[PDB]
Amino acid sequence: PFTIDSARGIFPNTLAADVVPATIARFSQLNAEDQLALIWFAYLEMGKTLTIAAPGAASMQLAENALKEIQAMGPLQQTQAMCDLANRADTPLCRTYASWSPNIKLGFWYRLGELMEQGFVAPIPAGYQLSANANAVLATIQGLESGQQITVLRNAVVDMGFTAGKDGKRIAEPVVPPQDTASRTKVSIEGVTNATVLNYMDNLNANDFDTLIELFTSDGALQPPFQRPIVGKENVLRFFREECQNLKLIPERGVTEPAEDGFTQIKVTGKVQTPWFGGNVGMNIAWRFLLNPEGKIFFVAIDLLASPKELLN
Ligand SMILES: CC1=C(/C=C/C(C)=C/C=C/C(C)=C/C=C/C=C(C)/C=C/C=C(C)/C=C/C2=C(C)C(=O)CCC2(C)C)C(C)(C)CCC1=O
Ligand SMILES: [Cl-]
């Protein structure tokens, strides 16, 4: 008697940074022009100390057409297209944007940000003043750990556009070939020698998604931070290929415990780096694995932890 939804409760002591979804919820109530101005301010300040990596060439080619169209617009239509995105309005641009994977959306906005700084796309009005709720939301963001700040930014970007009733076409970056076997690193985890867990981390660090997916049970699931579980090999594999490329998992230590019915539950804590920021932002992460008797992954959750004080010991 162990289901995906019940497995979500293992290691319930684990204190996730639920300020992140809380802040996204407050952010999403705001006026669209405040949403845009708020991210503009946060992004400008964050950039004084955090350098964002340039978008990949393939991603920028996929966003090029939409970026060209916006550039050909007059300033008022440019501002209107950005508000449409933030409002999740139903427009052709908003539907194109909603078909994109997160990295393509992120590179789209990265490039609009550069063009706004250069004055080639309508900027945020000079001297713009946020609303009462918006100033408070921005203050909250600026008080978070950098790992939490960039999660808020990405989740806000992913939220934009019109994805209503959208199980249709998905546009994503091409799949990078797995790291050659001779150059792959091998993680070490204090306390944890489980082969499934170590192979999980090593294969993801090598972008070896075909090998990684075979560690899962047919009906197994993966739960990203603050998102519902992704269920089944088909869906988990799609997620890997479209959204999980070029991560760096740096686990540190863990604990291994029996679970009901010859299962095993393992919790590991450490850091994860996104290619957007590399070593400049280390996110505090827990991994919560539920393995069946054969060692297959029935459930794995990845949690963004509330602070470094939540890392094991
Ligand atoms: C929008 C906008 C702007 C632009 C703003 C811009 C350019 C914003 C860009 C912000 C960027 C690029 C943020 C990068 C975020 C990446 C994160 C949080 C990834 C974490 C990865 C994790 C947790 C991986 C976890 C994983 C592990 C380890 C697994 O083991 C399994 C897989 C899994 C994935 C779960 C302007 C500046 C133009 C202003 C207007 C405006 O609105
Ligand atoms: Cl990423």
Author numbering: 2 to 314
Paper lines:
A kind of “molecular surgery” with “atomic mutations” is required to remove or replace individual atoms or groups of atoms in the context of complex proteins containing thousands of atoms with a complicated network of, for example, covalent, non-covalent or hydrogen bonding and van der Waals interactions. Structurally, the 35 kDa OCP consists of an N-terminal domain (NTD) composed entirely of α-helices and a mixed α/β-type C-terminal domain (CTD) of about equal size, both encapsulating a single ketocarotenoid molecule in a common central cavity. Upon absorption of a photon, OCP converts from the dark-adapted, orange OCPO state to the red, active OCPR state. By exposing the chromophore to the terminally emitting pigments of the PBSs, OCPR acts as an efficient quencher of PBS fluorescence, protecting the underlying photosystems from the deleterious effects of overexcitation and dissipating the electronic excitation energy into heat.
To this end, we used a recently evolved orthogonal pair consisting of a custom-tailored Methanosarcina mazei pyrrolysine tRNA synthetase (MmPylRS) and its cognate tRNA to replace Trp288 in OCP with 3-benzothienyl-L-alanine (BTA), an isostructural analogue of tryptophan in which the imino nitrogen is substituted by a sulphur atom. A close inspection of Figure 5A clearly shows that the BTA mutation has no significant effect on the global OCP structure, and the different geometry of the BTA side chain (C-S-C angle of 92.5°) compared to Trp288 (C-N-C angle of 109°) is nicely reflected by the electron density. The introduced BTA residue matches well with its native Trp288 counterpart, resulting in an almost identical spatial arrangement (i.e., isomorphic replacement). Interestingly, the distance to the keto oxygen atoms of the ECN/CAN cofactors increases only slightly from 2.9 Å in the wild-type protein to 3.2 Å and 3.3 Å, respectively, despite the potential repulsion of the lone electron pairs of sulphur, which, however, do not appear as a significant electron density in the 2mFo-DFc map. In addition, the distance between Tyr201 and the keto oxygen of ECN and is almost identical at 2.5 Å compared to 2.6 Å in wild-type OCP.
